[PDB]
Amino acid sequence: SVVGSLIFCLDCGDLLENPNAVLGSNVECSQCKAIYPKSQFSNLKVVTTTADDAFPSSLRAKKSVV
Amino acid sequence: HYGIQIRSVRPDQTSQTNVLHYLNDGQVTFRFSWRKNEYLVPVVMILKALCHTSDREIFDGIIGNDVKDSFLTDRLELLLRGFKKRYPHLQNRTQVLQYLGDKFRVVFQASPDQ
Amino acid sequence: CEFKLELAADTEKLLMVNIVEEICRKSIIRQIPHIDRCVHPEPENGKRV
Amino acid sequence: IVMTASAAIKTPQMTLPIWNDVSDEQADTFCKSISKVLLSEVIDKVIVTETTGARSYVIHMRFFDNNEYSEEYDVSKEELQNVISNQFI
Amino acid sequence: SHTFAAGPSLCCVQIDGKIIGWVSHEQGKIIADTLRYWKVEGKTPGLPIDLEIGYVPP
Numbered sequence: 001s002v003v004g005s006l007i008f009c010l011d012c013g014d015l016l017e018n019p020n021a022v023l024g025s026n027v028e029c030s031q032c033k034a035i036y037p038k039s040q041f042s043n044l045k046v047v048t049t050t051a052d053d054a055f056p057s058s059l060r061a062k063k064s065v066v
Numbered sequence: 067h068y069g070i071q072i073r074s075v076r077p078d079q080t081s082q083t084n085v086l087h088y089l090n091d092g093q094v095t096f097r098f099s100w101r102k103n104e105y106l107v108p109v110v111m112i113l114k115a116l117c118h119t120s121d122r123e124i125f126d127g128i129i130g131n132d133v134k135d136s137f138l139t140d141r142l143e144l145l146l147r148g149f150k151k152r153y154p155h156l157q158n159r160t161q162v163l164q165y166l167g168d169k170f171r172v173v174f175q176a177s178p179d180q
Numbered sequence: 181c182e183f184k185l186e187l188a189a190d191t192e193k194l195l196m197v198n199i200v201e202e203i204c205r206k207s208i209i210r211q212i213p214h215i216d217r218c219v220h221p222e223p224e225n226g227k228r229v
Numbered sequence: 230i231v232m233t234a235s236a237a238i239k240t241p242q243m244t245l246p247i248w249n250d251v252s253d254e255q256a257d258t259f260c261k262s263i264s265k266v267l268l269s270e271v272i273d274k275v276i277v278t279e280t281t282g283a284r285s286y287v288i289h290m291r292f293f294d295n296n297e298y299s300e301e302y303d304v305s306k307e308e309l310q311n312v313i314s315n316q317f318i
Numbered sequence: 319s320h321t322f323a324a325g326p327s328l329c330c331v332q333i334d335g336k337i338i339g340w341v342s343h344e345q346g347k348i349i350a351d352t353l354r355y356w357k358v359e360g361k362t363p364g365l366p367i368d369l370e371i372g373y374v375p376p
C-alpha cells in the first residue's frame with residue numbers, strides 16, 4: 001500500500017496522512033481507523049527526471065542528429 | 067492555459083458543457099453553467115459523489131500500471147491531499163453529496179421538500 | 181553537480197521539478213543586459229554587418 | 230512606429246559595423262561573447278530525489294561534456310560553478 | 319468493470335461517449351479494421367453502415 005510518496009490503507013484504500021505530521025509510532029486511518037505502525041513503512045523515495053523538452057538549446061539539437 | 071472540454075448531449079438533443087481546468091497548484095477544477103453564470107467545483111468532490119469510491123480507486127483509475135511515472139504520481143498527490151486539506155469532512159458518498167446539494171439548492175430552484 | 185536541500189515536516193509537497201526548470205531558464209551564465217543574441221549575416225551591399 | 234510609438238518594440242535590433250582590420254573569424258568568435266548563455270543551455274537532465282521519513286531533496290543536475298559546452302558556448306568549468314553557487318541557488 | 323488500466327499506453331474503446339473497455343494499440347487497430355470490414359459487408363446484424371469508427375493510432 002506504498003506507491004510513490006503516498007500511502008493507502010490496506011482495508012479501505014483511503015489515503016493515509018503524511019507520516020511526519022502525525023504523532024510517533026502510529027498512523028491512523030480516517031475511515032477504518034486502522035492504526036498502522038509509523039516505524040518502517042519504507043523510506044519514501046521518488047526520483048523525477050526532467051521532461052527532456054524542458055531545456056531547449058543549440059547543443060541539445062546536436063544530440064539526436066549525431 | 068491547459069484544460070479539457072466535453073459537450074455532452076441529452077437524448078432530447080440538449081447540450082451541456084463540462085470543462086476541467088488545470089491549476090498550477092496541482093489541483094483541477096470542474097466547471098459548468100446552469101444559468102448564464104459559471105460555477106467552479108473541485109473534481110474530487112464530484113468523483114466522490116458519483117459512486118461509492120475508495121481513495122486508491124481514484125489513484126488506480128487515473129494511473130494505469132505506470133506507477134513509476136513520477137510526473138503523474140506527484141500531480142495526483144496534490145489533488146487527493148488538497149481535498150483532504152480543504153475538506154476534513156466529506157468522507158463518504160452520502161456526505162459529499164449533501165454539501166454539493168446545499169450550495170446549489172437556491173440556484174437549482176429546489177423545493178423545501180427536497 | 182549535486183546539492184542536498186532540506187525542509188521540515190510542516191511543509192506539504194512542492195513539485196520541485198517545475199521549480200528547478202523555471203529557475204534554470206532564468207539563471208544566466210554570461211549575459212550582456214538587454215541583448216539576447218548576436219548574429220553575423222552575409223555582407224549586404226558591401227559593408228560588414 | 231507611427232501609431233503606438235512603442236518603447237517596448239516587438240523585435241529590437243542593433244547593427245554593428247565591423248572594422249576592416251579584423252577578419253570574419255574574429256567576428257563569429259566575438260558574437261559568442263555577446264550572445265547570452267542560459268543555465269538551461271548547458272544541462273542535459275536534472276534528477277531530483279525526494280526522501281521523507283525532514284524533507285530531503287537531492288538535486289542532481291547532469292550537464293553536457295566539458296568538451297561539448299565549452300566549445301559551443303565557450304563556458305568554462307569554473308564559471309559554471311559560480312553560477313550555481315552565486316546565481317542559481 | 320474488470321480492466322485496471324488507463325493512460326495512452328493502452329487504447330480506450332468508446333461508443334458514443336462511454337467506456338466499453340480497454341485493449342492494446344496493436345489489437346485495437348485489428349478490431350478497427352475488422353469492424354469496417356463487417357459494417358460494409360452487411361451480414362453482421364449489429365453494425366450499421368452509418369457508424370463512424372474513428373481509430374486514433376498511437
Ligand SMILES: [Zn+2]
Binds near residue numbers: 009014
Ligand atoms: Zn482504513
